[PDB]
Design a protein around this motif. Structure first.
Motif, PDB file in Angstrom:
ATOM      1  N   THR A 167       0.822  -1.314  -0.063  1.00 46.84           N
ATOM      2  CA  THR A 167       0.146  -0.003  -0.046  1.00 46.84           C
ATOM      3  C   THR A 167       0.890   1.176   0.156  1.00 46.84           C
ATOM      4  N   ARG A 168       0.272   2.505  -0.277  1.00 46.47           N
ATOM      5  CA  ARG A 168       0.939   3.707  -0.317  1.00 46.47           C
ATOM      6  C   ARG A 168      -0.186   4.612   0.505  1.00 46.47           C
ATOM      7  N   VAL A 169       0.539   5.540   1.204  1.00 45.11           N
ATOM      8  CA  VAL A 169      -0.420   6.383   2.265  1.00 45.11           C
ATOM      9  C   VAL A 169      -0.707   7.643   1.469  1.00 45.11           C
ATOM     10  N   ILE A 170      -2.401   7.786   1.684  1.00 40.67           N
ATOM     11  CA  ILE A 170      -2.902   9.029   0.951  1.00 40.67           C
ATOM     12  C   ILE A 170      -2.921   9.807   1.977  1.00 40.67           C
ATOM     13  N   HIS A 171      -2.113  10.974   2.002  1.00 40.84           N
ATOM     14  CA  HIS A 171      -1.920  11.878   3.148  1.00 40.84           C
ATOM     15  C   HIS A 171      -3.178  12.933   3.312  1.00 40.84           C
ATOM     16  N   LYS A 172      -3.516  13.037   4.541  1.00 42.95           N
ATOM     17  CA  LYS A 172      -4.261  14.205   4.845  1.00 42.95           C
ATOM     18  C   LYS A 172      -3.525  15.477   4.842  1.00 42.95           C
ATOM     19  N   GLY A 194      -9.313  18.729   3.057  1.00 42.82           N
ATOM     20  CA  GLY A 194      -9.276  18.468   4.297  1.00 42.82           C
ATOM     21  C   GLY A 194      -9.905  17.225   4.737  1.00 42.82           C
ATOM     22  N   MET A 195      -9.307  15.813   4.565  1.00 41.95           N
ATOM     23  CA  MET A 195      -9.963  14.750   5.166  1.00 41.95           C
ATOM     24  C   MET A 195      -9.568  14.562   6.628  1.00 41.95           C
ATOM     25  N   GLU A 196     -10.196  14.044   7.567  1.00 40.75           N
ATOM     26  CA  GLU A 196      -9.842  13.998   8.890  1.00 40.75           C
ATOM     27  C   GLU A 196      -8.563  13.082   9.111  1.00 40.75           C
ATOM     28  N   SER A 197      -8.324  11.945   8.246  1.00 40.28           N
ATOM     29  CA  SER A 197      -7.395  10.945   8.535  1.00 40.28           C
ATOM     30  C   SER A 197      -6.750  10.826   7.210  1.00 40.28           C
ATOM     31  N   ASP A 198      -5.459  10.164   7.317  1.00 44.50           N
ATOM     32  CA  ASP A 198      -4.744   9.650   6.345  1.00 44.50           C
ATOM     33  C   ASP A 198      -5.620   8.543   5.893  1.00 44.50           C
ATOM     34  N   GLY A 199      -5.653   8.153   4.322  1.00 45.11           N
ATOM     35  CA  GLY A 199      -6.100   6.952   3.629  1.00 45.11           C
ATOM     36  C   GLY A 199      -4.847   6.057   3.363  1.00 45.11           C
ATOM     37  N   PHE A 200      -5.107   5.163   2.849  1.00 47.25           N
ATOM     38  CA  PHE A 200      -4.070   4.196   1.973  1.00 47.25           C
ATOM     39  C   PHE A 200      -4.771   3.540   0.903  1.00 47.25           C
ATOM     40  N   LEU A 251      -8.622   1.196  -1.987  1.00 54.50           N
ATOM     41  CA  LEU A 251      -8.524   2.438  -1.183  1.00 54.50           C
ATOM     42  C   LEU A 251      -9.248   2.235   0.322  1.00 54.50           C
ATOM     43  N   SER A 252      -8.615   2.523   1.369  1.00 48.10           N
ATOM     44  CA  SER A 252      -9.229   2.435   2.672  1.00 48.10           C
ATOM     45  C   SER A 252      -9.213   4.010   3.263  1.00 48.10           C
ATOM     46  N   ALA A 253     -10.248   4.230   3.908  1.00 47.28           N
ATOM     47  CA  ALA A 253     -10.506   5.338   4.303  1.00 47.28           C
ATOM     48  C   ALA A 253     -11.610   5.332   5.517  1.00 47.28           C
ATOM     49  N   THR A 254     -11.558   6.425   6.512  1.00 52.34           N
ATOM     50  CA  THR A 254     -12.625   6.213   7.495  1.00 52.34           C
ATOM     51  C   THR A 254     -13.846   6.683   6.850  1.00 52.34           C
ATOM     52  N   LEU A 255     -15.110   6.362   7.683  1.00 55.16           N
ATOM     53  CA  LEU A 255     -16.250   6.491   7.121  1.00 55.16           C
ATOM     54  C   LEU A 255     -16.462   8.224   6.691  1.00 55.16           C
ATOM     55  N   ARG A 256     -16.303   8.909   7.571  1.00 52.65           N
ATOM     56  CA  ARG A 256     -16.205  10.523   7.401  1.00 52.65           C
ATOM     57  C   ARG A 256     -15.541  10.870   6.360  1.00 52.65           C
ATOM     58  N   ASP A 257     -14.330  10.362   6.011  1.00 49.77           N
ATOM     59  CA  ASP A 257     -13.544  10.827   4.911  1.00 49.77           C
ATOM     60  C   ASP A 257     -14.315  10.118   3.429  1.00 49.77           C
ATOM     61  N   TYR A 258     -14.815   9.047   3.506  1.00 48.83           N
ATOM     62  CA  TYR A 258     -15.533   8.762   2.409  1.00 48.83           C
ATOM     63  C   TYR A 258     -16.621   9.738   2.162  1.00 48.83           C
ATOM     64  N   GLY A 259     -17.363  10.208   3.128  1.00 43.66           N
ATOM     65  CA  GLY A 259     -18.238  11.298   3.079  1.00 43.66           C
ATOM     66  C   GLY A 259     -17.802  12.563   2.409  1.00 43.66           C
ATOM     67  N   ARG A 260     -16.552  12.935   2.887  1.00 47.50           N
ATOM     68  CA  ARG A 260     -15.866  14.191   2.380  1.00 47.50           C
ATOM     69  C   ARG A 260     -15.578  14.060   0.972  1.00 47.50           C
ATOM     70  N   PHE A 261     -15.180  12.892   0.368  1.00 54.06           N
ATOM     71  CA  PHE A 261     -15.149  12.739  -0.991  1.00 54.06           C
ATOM     72  C   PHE A 261     -16.376  12.994  -1.629  1.00 54.06           C
ATOM     73  N   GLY A 262     -17.391  12.349  -0.940  1.00 56.67           N
ATOM     74  CA  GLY A 262     -18.590  12.393  -1.645  1.00 56.67           C
ATOM     75  C   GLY A 262     -19.277  13.811  -1.513  1.00 56.67           C
TER      76      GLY A 262
END
Length: 346
Positions: free
Chosen positions: A33-38, A235-241, A257-268
Protein backbone atom coordinates in the motif's frame (compact mmCIF):
# COMPACT_ATOMS: atom_id res chain seq x y z
CA UNK A 1 -10.09 -8.55 23.01
CA UNK A 2 -9.18 -10.94 20.18
CA UNK A 3 -6.32 -11.65 17.82
CA UNK A 4 -7.28 -10.20 14.42
CA UNK A 5 -8.63 -12.55 11.76
CA UNK A 6 -6.62 -11.62 8.68
CA UNK A 7 -6.67 -13.90 5.66
CA UNK A 8 -4.13 -14.87 3.04
CA UNK A 9 -3.69 -12.30 0.30
CA UNK A 10 -4.97 -14.80 -2.25
CA UNK A 11 -8.37 -15.32 -0.54
CA UNK A 12 -9.59 -11.71 -0.58
CA UNK A 13 -12.67 -12.63 -2.62
CA UNK A 14 -13.34 -15.96 -0.79
CA UNK A 15 -12.83 -15.11 2.89
CA UNK A 16 -15.07 -16.81 5.45
CA UNK A 17 -17.31 -14.35 7.38
CA UNK A 18 -15.31 -14.26 10.64
CA UNK A 19 -12.27 -13.09 8.64
CA UNK A 20 -13.96 -10.42 6.50
CA UNK A 21 -14.17 -7.36 8.81
CA UNK A 22 -10.64 -7.70 10.16
CA UNK A 23 -9.11 -8.10 6.69
CA UNK A 24 -11.25 -5.35 5.16
CA UNK A 25 -9.86 -2.87 7.70
CA UNK A 26 -6.25 -4.18 7.68
CA UNK A 27 -5.47 -4.37 3.98
CA UNK A 28 -2.16 -2.60 4.67
CA UNK A 29 -1.11 -5.75 6.53
CA UNK A 30 -1.88 -8.04 3.55
CA UNK A 31 -1.03 -6.06 0.40
CA UNK A 32 1.52 -3.44 -0.67
CA UNK A 33 0.00 0.00 0.00
CA UNK A 34 0.87 3.69 -0.18
CA UNK A 35 -0.40 6.37 2.19
CA UNK A 36 -2.92 8.94 0.96
CA UNK A 37 -1.91 11.84 3.20
CA UNK A 38 -4.34 14.18 4.81
CA UNK A 39 -3.40 17.84 5.17
CA UNK A 40 -3.46 20.26 8.12
CA UNK A 41 -7.00 21.64 7.79
CA UNK A 42 -10.07 19.40 8.11
CA UNK A 43 -13.37 20.22 6.49
CA UNK A 44 -16.02 20.07 9.23
CA UNK A 45 -18.97 17.70 9.00
CA UNK A 46 -21.21 19.38 11.58
CA UNK A 47 -24.08 17.70 13.34
CA UNK A 48 -27.16 17.97 11.14
CA UNK A 49 -30.81 16.96 11.24
CA UNK A 50 -30.93 13.72 13.24
CA UNK A 51 -33.15 11.19 11.45
CA UNK A 52 -34.38 7.68 12.34
CA UNK A 53 -35.42 6.16 9.03
CA UNK A 54 -37.62 3.08 8.85
CA UNK A 55 -38.51 1.05 5.78
CA UNK A 56 -40.77 -1.80 4.68
CA UNK A 57 -39.69 -5.05 3.04
CA UNK A 58 -42.27 -7.73 2.36
CA UNK A 59 -44.43 -7.75 5.45
CA UNK A 60 -42.17 -6.11 7.99
CA UNK A 61 -40.80 -2.67 8.81
CA UNK A 62 -37.12 -2.36 9.77
CA UNK A 63 -35.04 0.33 11.43
CA UNK A 64 -31.37 1.17 11.43
CA UNK A 65 -30.27 -1.61 13.78
CA UNK A 66 -32.39 -4.02 11.79
CA UNK A 67 -30.71 -3.01 8.53
CA UNK A 68 -27.22 -3.25 10.00
CA UNK A 69 -27.79 -6.63 11.65
CA UNK A 70 -29.71 -8.22 8.77
CA UNK A 71 -27.18 -7.07 6.18
CA UNK A 72 -24.01 -7.21 8.33
CA UNK A 73 -23.27 -3.52 7.91
CA UNK A 74 -20.02 -2.12 9.33
CA UNK A 75 -20.87 1.53 8.65
CA UNK A 76 -23.58 4.01 7.59
CA UNK A 77 -23.16 7.74 7.04
CA UNK A 78 -25.97 9.98 5.80
CA UNK A 79 -25.09 13.64 5.13
CA UNK A 80 -27.66 16.30 4.28
CA UNK A 81 -26.31 19.65 3.10
CA UNK A 82 -22.85 18.63 4.31
CA UNK A 83 -24.07 18.00 7.87
CA UNK A 84 -24.16 14.60 9.58
CA UNK A 85 -27.76 13.32 9.61
CA UNK A 86 -26.95 9.70 10.50
CA UNK A 87 -23.74 7.99 11.61
CA UNK A 88 -23.40 4.39 12.79
CA UNK A 89 -20.51 1.92 13.06
CA UNK A 90 -20.61 -1.87 13.27
CA UNK A 91 -18.62 -5.13 13.32
CA UNK A 92 -16.25 -3.48 15.80
CA UNK A 93 -15.42 -0.46 13.63
CA UNK A 94 -15.24 3.06 15.05
CA UNK A 95 -14.70 6.48 13.52
CA UNK A 96 -10.96 5.89 13.05
CA UNK A 97 -11.29 2.68 11.04
CA UNK A 98 -10.06 2.65 7.45
CA UNK A 99 -12.22 0.29 5.39
CA UNK A 100 -11.41 -1.12 1.93
CA UNK A 101 -13.48 0.15 -1.00
CA UNK A 102 -13.51 -2.50 -3.75
CA UNK A 103 -14.92 -1.07 -6.99
CA UNK A 104 -16.02 2.08 -5.16
CA UNK A 105 -12.55 3.46 -5.73
CA UNK A 106 -13.25 3.41 -9.47
CA UNK A 107 -15.28 6.58 -9.06
CA UNK A 108 -12.41 8.11 -7.11
CA UNK A 109 -10.01 7.15 -9.89
CA UNK A 110 -12.46 8.59 -12.39
CA UNK A 111 -12.76 11.87 -10.51
CA UNK A 112 -8.98 12.10 -10.38
CA UNK A 113 -8.88 11.76 -14.17
CA UNK A 114 -11.21 14.76 -14.28
CA UNK A 115 -8.79 16.59 -12.00
CA UNK A 116 -5.96 15.84 -14.42
CA UNK A 117 -8.08 17.08 -17.27
CA UNK A 118 -8.72 20.33 -15.42
CA UNK A 119 -4.93 20.82 -15.03
CA UNK A 120 -4.18 20.11 -18.70
CA UNK A 121 -2.19 16.97 -17.82
CA UNK A 122 -4.65 14.58 -19.49
CA UNK A 123 -7.00 15.04 -22.43
CA UNK A 124 -9.95 12.80 -23.24
CA UNK A 125 -9.31 12.66 -27.00
CA UNK A 126 -5.64 11.72 -26.65
CA UNK A 127 -4.47 8.16 -27.38
CA UNK A 128 -3.67 6.01 -24.40
CA UNK A 129 -0.39 4.75 -25.89
CA UNK A 130 0.83 8.37 -25.96
CA UNK A 131 0.77 8.34 -22.16
CA UNK A 132 1.68 4.63 -21.76
CA UNK A 133 4.06 3.60 -24.55
CA UNK A 134 4.20 0.03 -23.24
CA UNK A 135 0.69 -0.30 -24.69
CA UNK A 136 2.01 0.26 -28.19
CA UNK A 137 1.51 -2.87 -30.29
CA UNK A 138 -1.45 -4.01 -28.19
CA UNK A 139 -5.13 -3.75 -28.99
CA UNK A 140 -5.15 -0.60 -26.82
CA UNK A 141 -2.99 1.35 -29.26
CA UNK A 142 -5.17 4.12 -30.64
CA UNK A 143 -7.86 3.88 -27.96
CA UNK A 144 -8.51 7.30 -26.46
CA UNK A 145 -8.68 8.21 -22.78
CA UNK A 146 -12.40 8.80 -23.25
CA UNK A 147 -13.03 5.32 -24.61
CA UNK A 148 -11.18 3.89 -21.62
CA UNK A 149 -13.24 5.90 -19.10
CA UNK A 150 -16.48 4.64 -20.67
CA UNK A 151 -15.43 0.98 -20.96
CA UNK A 152 -15.76 1.33 -24.72
CA UNK A 153 -12.33 0.30 -25.93
CA UNK A 154 -13.81 -2.79 -27.60
CA UNK A 155 -10.99 -5.00 -26.32
CA UNK A 156 -11.93 -8.56 -25.34
CA UNK A 157 -12.20 -8.94 -21.57
CA UNK A 158 -13.48 -11.74 -19.33
CA UNK A 159 -14.66 -10.32 -16.01
CA UNK A 160 -16.03 -13.57 -14.53
CA UNK A 161 -14.14 -14.58 -11.35
CA UNK A 162 -14.97 -18.33 -11.29
CA UNK A 163 -13.03 -18.75 -14.55
CA UNK A 164 -9.46 -19.06 -13.17
CA UNK A 165 -8.35 -18.27 -16.76
CA UNK A 166 -10.46 -15.08 -16.68
CA UNK A 167 -8.87 -11.74 -17.41
CA UNK A 168 -10.04 -10.48 -14.00
CA UNK A 169 -8.52 -13.57 -12.37
CA UNK A 170 -5.24 -13.10 -14.20
CA UNK A 171 -5.25 -9.45 -13.08
CA UNK A 172 -5.58 -10.58 -9.47
CA UNK A 173 -2.84 -13.16 -10.19
CA UNK A 174 -0.51 -10.38 -11.31
CA UNK A 175 -1.40 -8.37 -8.21
CA UNK A 176 -0.48 -11.46 -6.15
CA UNK A 177 2.85 -11.85 -7.98
CA UNK A 178 3.65 -8.29 -6.76
CA UNK A 179 5.59 -7.40 -9.93
CA UNK A 180 5.41 -3.86 -11.36
CA UNK A 181 3.80 -3.81 -14.77
CA UNK A 182 2.05 -7.18 -14.50
CA UNK A 183 -1.44 -5.79 -15.05
CA UNK A 184 -0.14 -3.71 -17.95
CA UNK A 185 1.38 -6.82 -19.50
CA UNK A 186 -1.97 -8.57 -19.27
CA UNK A 187 -3.69 -5.54 -20.80
CA UNK A 188 -1.10 -5.56 -23.59
CA UNK A 189 -1.81 -9.23 -24.34
CA UNK A 190 -5.55 -8.81 -25.03
CA UNK A 191 -7.02 -8.87 -28.56
CA UNK A 192 -9.56 -6.64 -30.21
CA UNK A 193 -13.21 -7.70 -30.28
CA UNK A 194 -15.35 -4.65 -31.14
CA UNK A 195 -14.56 -1.31 -32.83
CA UNK A 196 -13.54 1.42 -30.43
CA UNK A 197 -16.34 3.46 -28.90
CA UNK A 198 -19.23 1.17 -29.85
CA UNK A 199 -19.57 -1.62 -27.28
CA UNK A 200 -19.56 -1.53 -23.47
CA UNK A 201 -17.59 -4.28 -21.71
CA UNK A 202 -17.13 -3.68 -17.99
CA UNK A 203 -13.41 -4.29 -17.48
CA UNK A 204 -11.70 -4.01 -14.12
CA UNK A 205 -8.33 -3.82 -15.89
CA UNK A 206 -9.61 -1.05 -18.14
CA UNK A 207 -10.69 0.63 -14.89
CA UNK A 208 -7.12 0.18 -13.59
CA UNK A 209 -5.79 1.94 -16.68
CA UNK A 210 -7.10 5.18 -15.14
CA UNK A 211 -4.57 4.80 -12.34
CA UNK A 212 -1.86 4.03 -14.86
CA UNK A 213 -2.83 7.02 -17.03
CA UNK A 214 -2.89 9.31 -14.03
CA UNK A 215 0.59 8.31 -12.95
CA UNK A 216 1.85 8.78 -16.51
CA UNK A 217 0.26 12.21 -16.90
CA UNK A 218 0.93 13.65 -13.44
CA UNK A 219 4.25 11.78 -13.00
CA UNK A 220 3.60 11.34 -9.26
CA UNK A 221 2.13 8.48 -7.22
CA UNK A 222 -1.63 8.49 -7.54
CA UNK A 223 -2.02 8.50 -3.74
CA UNK A 224 -0.14 11.79 -3.70
CA UNK A 225 -2.22 13.27 -6.52
CA UNK A 226 -5.39 12.43 -4.62
CA UNK A 227 -3.79 14.02 -1.56
CA UNK A 228 -2.86 17.23 -3.40
CA UNK A 229 -6.15 17.63 -5.28
CA UNK A 230 -8.57 16.46 -2.57
CA UNK A 231 -7.37 14.64 0.51
CA UNK A 232 -5.09 17.38 1.87
CA UNK A 233 -6.86 20.34 0.14
CA UNK A 234 -10.47 20.20 1.31
CA UNK A 235 -9.14 18.34 4.30
CA UNK A 236 -9.99 14.79 5.20
CA UNK A 237 -9.73 14.07 8.89
CA UNK A 238 -7.52 11.00 8.45
CA UNK A 239 -4.83 9.52 6.25
CA UNK A 240 -6.12 7.01 3.75
CA UNK A 241 -4.10 4.40 1.95
CA UNK A 242 -4.25 2.68 -1.40
CA UNK A 243 -3.46 -0.92 -2.35
CA UNK A 244 -0.57 -1.26 -4.79
CA UNK A 245 0.40 -3.71 -7.48
CA UNK A 246 3.93 -4.09 -6.04
CA UNK A 247 6.02 -2.79 -3.13
CA UNK A 248 6.24 0.99 -3.56
CA UNK A 249 4.51 0.33 -6.87
CA UNK A 250 1.40 1.47 -8.72
CA UNK A 251 -2.04 2.13 -7.22
CA UNK A 252 -4.74 -0.38 -8.11
CA UNK A 253 -7.20 1.91 -9.90
CA UNK A 254 -10.12 -0.53 -9.56
CA UNK A 255 -9.90 -1.55 -5.85
CA UNK A 256 -7.84 -1.09 -2.67
CA UNK A 257 -8.59 2.32 -1.15
CA UNK A 258 -9.07 2.37 2.63
CA UNK A 259 -10.50 5.42 4.43
CA UNK A 260 -12.54 6.37 7.44
CA UNK A 261 -16.31 6.62 7.12
CA UNK A 262 -16.38 10.41 7.39
CA UNK A 263 -13.56 10.74 4.87
CA UNK A 264 -15.53 8.62 2.42
CA UNK A 265 -18.27 11.16 3.06
CA UNK A 266 -15.93 14.09 2.43
CA UNK A 267 -15.07 12.69 -0.97
CA UNK A 268 -18.80 12.34 -1.64
CA UNK A 269 -19.41 15.95 -0.55
CA UNK A 270 -16.59 17.07 -2.85
CA UNK A 271 -18.39 15.40 -5.73
CA UNK A 272 -21.71 16.84 -4.57
CA UNK A 273 -20.19 20.33 -4.71
CA UNK A 274 -18.93 19.74 -8.27
CA UNK A 275 -15.38 19.56 -6.99
CA UNK A 276 -15.06 23.16 -5.82
CA UNK A 277 -12.84 23.59 -2.75
CA UNK A 278 -12.47 27.13 -1.32
CA UNK A 279 -13.26 28.84 -4.64
CA UNK A 280 -10.89 26.67 -6.71
CA UNK A 281 -12.60 24.46 -9.30
CA UNK A 282 -10.73 21.17 -8.95
CA UNK A 283 -12.94 19.41 -11.53
CA UNK A 284 -13.82 20.63 -15.02
CA UNK A 285 -17.10 22.39 -15.62
CA UNK A 286 -19.97 19.94 -15.74
CA UNK A 287 -17.55 17.05 -15.22
CA UNK A 288 -19.88 15.66 -12.52
CA UNK A 289 -22.84 16.31 -14.87
CA UNK A 290 -21.34 14.17 -17.65
CA UNK A 291 -19.90 11.66 -15.18
CA UNK A 292 -23.47 10.94 -14.13
CA UNK A 293 -25.07 11.41 -17.55
CA UNK A 294 -28.25 9.48 -18.30
CA UNK A 295 -28.42 10.66 -8.82
CA UNK A 296 -25.34 8.46 -9.09
CA UNK A 297 -23.40 5.92 -7.09
CA UNK A 298 -20.21 4.00 -6.69
CA UNK A 299 -20.57 0.40 -5.62
CA UNK A 300 -18.31 -2.47 -4.67
CA UNK A 301 -18.88 -6.12 -3.97
CA UNK A 302 -19.82 -7.40 -0.49
CA UNK A 303 -21.93 -4.27 -0.01
CA UNK A 304 -19.86 -1.10 -0.51
CA UNK A 305 -21.94 1.92 -1.53
CA UNK A 306 -21.38 5.63 -2.16
CA UNK A 307 -24.70 7.23 -3.09
CA UNK A 308 -24.91 10.90 -4.14
CA UNK A 309 -28.26 12.60 -4.84
CA UNK A 310 -27.48 16.15 -5.90
CA UNK A 311 -31.05 17.44 -6.15
CA UNK A 312 -31.54 16.43 -2.50
CA UNK A 313 -27.98 17.38 -1.47
CA UNK A 314 -27.55 13.95 0.12
CA UNK A 315 -24.35 11.93 0.46
CA UNK A 316 -24.51 8.39 1.86
CA UNK A 317 -21.69 5.93 2.59
CA UNK A 318 -22.44 2.27 3.29
CA UNK A 319 -19.81 -0.30 4.38
CA UNK A 320 -20.94 -3.93 4.54
CA UNK A 321 -19.56 -7.49 4.76
CA UNK A 322 -22.00 -9.61 2.78
CA UNK A 323 -21.01 -13.28 2.62
CA UNK A 324 -21.10 -13.21 -1.20
CA UNK A 325 -19.87 -10.51 -3.62
CA UNK A 326 -23.37 -9.83 -4.99
CA UNK A 327 -26.54 -10.62 -2.99
CA UNK A 328 -29.85 -9.51 -4.49
CA UNK A 329 -31.74 -9.49 -1.19
CA UNK A 330 -29.13 -7.20 0.35
CA UNK A 331 -29.09 -4.96 -2.72
CA UNK A 332 -32.86 -4.49 -2.59
CA UNK A 333 -32.74 -3.89 1.14
CA UNK A 334 -29.91 -1.34 0.85
CA UNK A 335 -31.71 0.64 -1.85
CA UNK A 336 -34.84 0.53 0.30
CA UNK A 337 -33.01 1.85 3.34
CA UNK A 338 -31.33 4.62 1.37
CA UNK A 339 -34.61 5.75 -0.16
CA UNK A 340 -36.17 5.75 3.29
CA UNK A 341 -33.44 8.07 4.57
CA UNK A 342 -33.84 10.35 1.55
CA UNK A 343 -37.58 10.55 2.09
CA UNK A 344 -37.07 11.18 5.79
CA UNK A 345 -34.81 14.15 4.91
CA UNK A 346 -37.40 16.17 2.93
Amino acid sequence: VENPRIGRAADLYELIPEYQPDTYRNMDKVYPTRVIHKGTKVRPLPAGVAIAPRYRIGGEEYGVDDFMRRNRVGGVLVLKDGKVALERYGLGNDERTRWTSFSVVKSISSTLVGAAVQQGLLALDQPVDKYLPSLAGSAYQGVTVEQVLQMSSGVRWNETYRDPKSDRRQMFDAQLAERPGGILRLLASLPRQYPSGTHFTYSTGESHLQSELLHAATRIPVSDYLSERIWARMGMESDGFWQLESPAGQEIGSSGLSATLRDYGRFGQFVLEDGVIDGERILPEGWVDRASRVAFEAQGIFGQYLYINRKEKIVAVVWSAWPKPEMDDREEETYAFLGAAVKALR
